[PDB]
Amino acid sequence: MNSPIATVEVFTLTQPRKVPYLGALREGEVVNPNGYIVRKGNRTVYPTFDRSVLVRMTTEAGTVGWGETYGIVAPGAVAALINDLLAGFVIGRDASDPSAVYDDLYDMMRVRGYTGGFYVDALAALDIALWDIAGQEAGKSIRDLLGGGVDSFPAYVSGLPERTLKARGELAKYWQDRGFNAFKFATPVADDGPAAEIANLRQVLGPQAKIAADMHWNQTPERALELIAEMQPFDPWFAEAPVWTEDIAGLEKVSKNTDVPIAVGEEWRTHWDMRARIERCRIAIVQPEMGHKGITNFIRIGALAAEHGIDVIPHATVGAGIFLAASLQASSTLSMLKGHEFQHSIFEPNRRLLDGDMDCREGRYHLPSGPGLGVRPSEAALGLIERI
Amino acid sequence: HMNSPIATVEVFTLTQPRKVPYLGALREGEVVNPNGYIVRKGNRTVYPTFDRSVLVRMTTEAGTVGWGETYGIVAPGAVAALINDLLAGFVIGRDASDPSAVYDDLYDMMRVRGYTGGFYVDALAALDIALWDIAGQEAGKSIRDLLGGGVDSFPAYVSGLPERTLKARGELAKYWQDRGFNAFKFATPVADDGPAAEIANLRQVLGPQAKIAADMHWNQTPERALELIAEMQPFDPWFAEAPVWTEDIAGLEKVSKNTDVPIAVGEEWRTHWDMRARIERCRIAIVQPEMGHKGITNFIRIGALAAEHGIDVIPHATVGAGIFLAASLQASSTLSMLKGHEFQHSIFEPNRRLLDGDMDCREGRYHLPSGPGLGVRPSEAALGLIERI
Ligand SMILES: [Cl-]
Ligand SMILES: [Mg+2]
Ligand SMILES: [Mg+2]
């Protein structure tokens, strides 16, 4: 029995701990008075606090569900979308068919081109909350609601936050000894270049280790192909984000001129974004980010990967643990799942910010027990959240 | 003619009652939702029950004041938050010596996280327009001059037939024809009797020399869109706009390659990247950039790509105070592939009092403002009405 949504409340949660940047701060870099920093290398903006947007959604009968999306930059954007536009269209609906609610909300602004970006960030938080409600009302975990899922799967170390190439290798080794078999490094970081870095990691970790290279977008297809040729002898697991997201022609060119598996997708929003690429390019792996996408989008991307034999290896980012729990629930149902990003500093906050038995130990994620997401914000989180 | 650093960036909304009958479009017992939004059941799209846009006032340390504008009909707090919290801080201290450089820097801040369009570029658009306005004022040149020169007038086509019946819609089109307009567009969903009946009526009323385009409003499968176009084809449609869903590029390829009726798209795009994704697969005859979504930098890059491929440019127009419309006229006038420009008579006319500056449209042609920069600004009356956000 599904009770109608009564209220939708939006919050930000700013954390007392901070995930390090991949790439030490350098001479010339500036902290803007507005609290943001642009990296001189990649030109991308970064926050000086970790922060996410949480949504509390409550039924008339008193069932409480939580959703979460990105809030590191301009959280008032998602907050405005939800408070001014979206909440009003969710209140009165129920959780009998969360995906139908998502589709209705998406369709409202589709023709004006708000098919991704912040609009879908907002839909993501709403969609997760609604599934959390649906699971609780059914007395079922979300993964059971979606037809069943495994209770554990492999995690890989998605980043190595140490300042030197030698230190990054020691950190990788530390995790290897603790059950991890797969690792990834960011190509722009090493002073001596990505070939030098993968060579070192391969030497340190041995032949069996899976070692991927996250190329962080900023290359022409020709340059990307060069870098990949240099890394190739060291048996890279995959090359991620070889060129700019918008440069589909470049992505096509790279993917068809190397046999190294190409992985993309953390910055997508919907299966529509995937269709645009897999129609032209040779994509081995897609890497959806729950916090940007929501459960509905996540499973549609999964289903499409299964139609084409594409591997699914979800991205992770720091948050309170709500969208991560959602990611685990949804990932567990996917036939094409081959792993899931993990970083200690990304995962650790959920220990204090969540109640629930979601865990990551010995190189594997373990799903929480219980209906819905299987988790909820802890008393600590409830004290830190601020309305927006 | 030096460039003074930006000192302040101020965001406002301007909200006003709609002055055109628009609820006549709701026939299935549609209900007003919180904050004044209403969803049309036939197309599932949300609409405001008022007119509203986001205005930006940008001022240099030396006191030059520029204005930009973007969409604000829906959740203007989104763009406002983006500007107030994030973007303003990276514009302040910069100057207008190279507005496109500032645009590229702002766009780059968030592009790898997938904020490559939507409300993010909405926000960049308002900032870009304001910066170009300042650039021109500081150089003592109109924007079009600063961009290498542009025409001072060009054809406008009529859109908006807010009459209940097919006949009255024809009569309305006739009136605008009598005023010197010779190009028109109608929305295919509007006709109870079908797009074929509508174009048939218009063609007869207006005669064979008139340009009559059909806006198909996205909601067809590619096969249904081809059928519809086939039904309209015998009446010489000027172009078929938005035959299928924006996301459905395969369907657009299919439609565009199975009809000789010119295909037009683009109002809901944000950058040349969106264009590239389409023209690389599809047969696009016309692109229809919307300045309020895009900004001048994005608009001229789209026009430049169009020139590379022999694609006509016929820009979109929409609800707004006239600030981004004026920016649209400035940028458009520099484009070799320009063939004309949408004209929303029902918005443009009553909004004259909201602007200072000589932007006009008459005798079927837009007439561009004469002054430096944008050439228009909010009137004293408009300044009385804007609210900070
Ligand atoms: Cl957006
Ligand atoms: Mg990555
Ligand atoms: Mg249109």
User: Strand, coil or helix: what is A96?
Assistant: coil
Q: How far apart are CA A350 and CA A341, in angstroms?
A: 15
- The ranges assigned to domains in chain A are 1-148+369-388, 149-368
Pair A56, A90: CB distance under 8 Å: no
Which letter does DSSP use for residue B85 in this model?
Answer: I
A 217-256: CB under 8 A from B: 217, 241, 244-249
Handedness of CA B336, B338, B339, B340 (dihedral sign): negative
Compute how many other C-beta atoms are within 10 angstroms of the C-beta atom of residue A352: 17
Give one word for A67, left, alpha or beta, with left for phi > 0 and alpha for psi -120 to 50: beta
Single-letter amino acid code for the residue at B270: R
CATH of A1-148+369-388, one of 3.40.50.1000, 1.10.10.10, 3.30.390.10, 3.40.50.1110: 3.30.390.10
Q: Could you identify the residue written with the tokens 């220990």? A: A351
Token output for A351: 């220990």
Q: How far apart are CA A384 and CA A352, in angstroms?
A: 11
Q: Which ligand sits nearest to residue B290's alpha carbon?
A: 3
Q: How far apart are CA B38 and CA B36, in angstroms?
A: 7
Backbone phi, then psi, for B346, in 5-degree steps? Answer: -70, -20
The nearest CA of chain A is from the CA of B217 a distance in Å of 8
Strands ordered across the beta sheet of A152-154: A152-154, A364-366, A359-361
Strands ordered across the beta sheet of A51-59: A64-70, A51-59, A5-14, A386-387
- Alpha helices, H only, A69-193: 75-80, 87-90, 98-107, 117-138, 142-145, 165-176
A 33-52: CB under 8 A from B: 33-34, 36, 38, 42-45
Compute how many other C-beta atoms are within 10 angstroms of the C-beta atom of residue B72: 29
Token output for A203: 């030497």
B150-369 and B1-149+370-389 share a CATH fold: no
Q: How far apart are CA A195 and CA A167, in angstroms?
A: 17
The upper half-sphere exposure of residue B86, i.e. CA atoms within 13 Å in the direction of its Cβ, equals 27
| Buried-state track A261-272, b at ≥16 Cβ within 10 A, e below 16 | bbbbbbbbbbbb
Q: Which residues pair with B215 in a beta bridge?
A: B187, B241
The nearest CA of chain A is from the CA of B383 a distance in Å of 24
The nearest CA of chain A is from the CA of B92 a distance in Å of 11
Q: How far apart are CA A159 and CA A156, in angstroms?
A: 9
Q: How far is CA A34 from CA A45, B4, B86, B90, B136, in A?
A: 12, 21, 7, 9, 28
Token output for A294: 């929501």
Residue A42 with chain B: CB contacts under 8 Å: 112
Number of H helices, E strands in chain A: 15, 19
The nearest CA of chain B is from the CA of A97 a distance in Å of 18
User: Strand, coil or helix: what is A44?
Assistant: coil
The upper half-sphere exposure of residue B154, i.e. CA atoms within 13 Å in the direction of its Cβ, equals 24
B 197-216: CB under 8 A from A: none
Q: Does B269 touch chain A (CB under 8 A)?
A: yes
Q: Could you identify the residue written with the tokens 């561009």? A: B368
Cα(B382) to ligand 2 centroid in Å equals 46
CATH architecture of B150-369: Alpha-Beta Barrel (3.20)
User: Strand, coil or helix: what is A335?
Assistant: coil
Experimental method: X-ray
User: Strand, coil or helix: what is B342?
Assistant: strand
Q: How far apart are CA B77 and CA A167, in angstroms?
A: 45
Compute how many other C-beta atoms are within 10 angstroms of the C-beta atom of residue A234: 17
Q: Is B267 annotated as a binding residue?
A: yes
User: Strand, coil or helix: what is B380?
Assistant: helix
Tallying the residues shown for chain B, one arrives at: 389
Token output for B210: 């008139």
Single-letter amino acid code for the residue at A104: D
Would the CB atoms of B110 and A45 count as touching at under 8 Å?
yes
Pair B61, B7: CB distance under 8 Å: yes
Number of H helices, E strands in chain B: 14, 18
Would the CB atoms of A80 and B84 count as touching at under 8 Å?
no
Pair A211, A235: CB distance under 8 Å: yes
Q: How far apart are CA B166 and CA B191, in angstroms?
A: 7
Q: How far apart are CA B289 and CA B324, in angstroms?
A: 12
Q: How far apart are CA B359 and CA B352, in angstroms?
A: 9
Token output for B110: 């968030």
A149-368 adopts what CATH topology?
Answer: TIM Barrel (3.20.20)
Q: How far apart are CA A145 and CA B86, in angstroms?
A: 39
Resolution of the deposited coordinates, in angstroms? 2.0
Q: How far is CA A292 from CA A215, A267, B179, in A?
A: 20, 8, 50
Single-letter amino acid code for the residue at B277: A
Tallying the residues shown for chain A, one arrives at: 388
Q: Which residues pair with B158 in a beta bridge?
A: B184, B343
What is the CA B188 to chain-centroid distance, rounded?
Answer: 19
Would the CB atoms of A76 and B85 count as touching at under 8 Å?
yes
B1-149+370-389 adopts what CATH topology?
Answer: Enolase-like; domain 1 (3.30.390)
Pair B220, B244: CB distance under 8 Å: yes
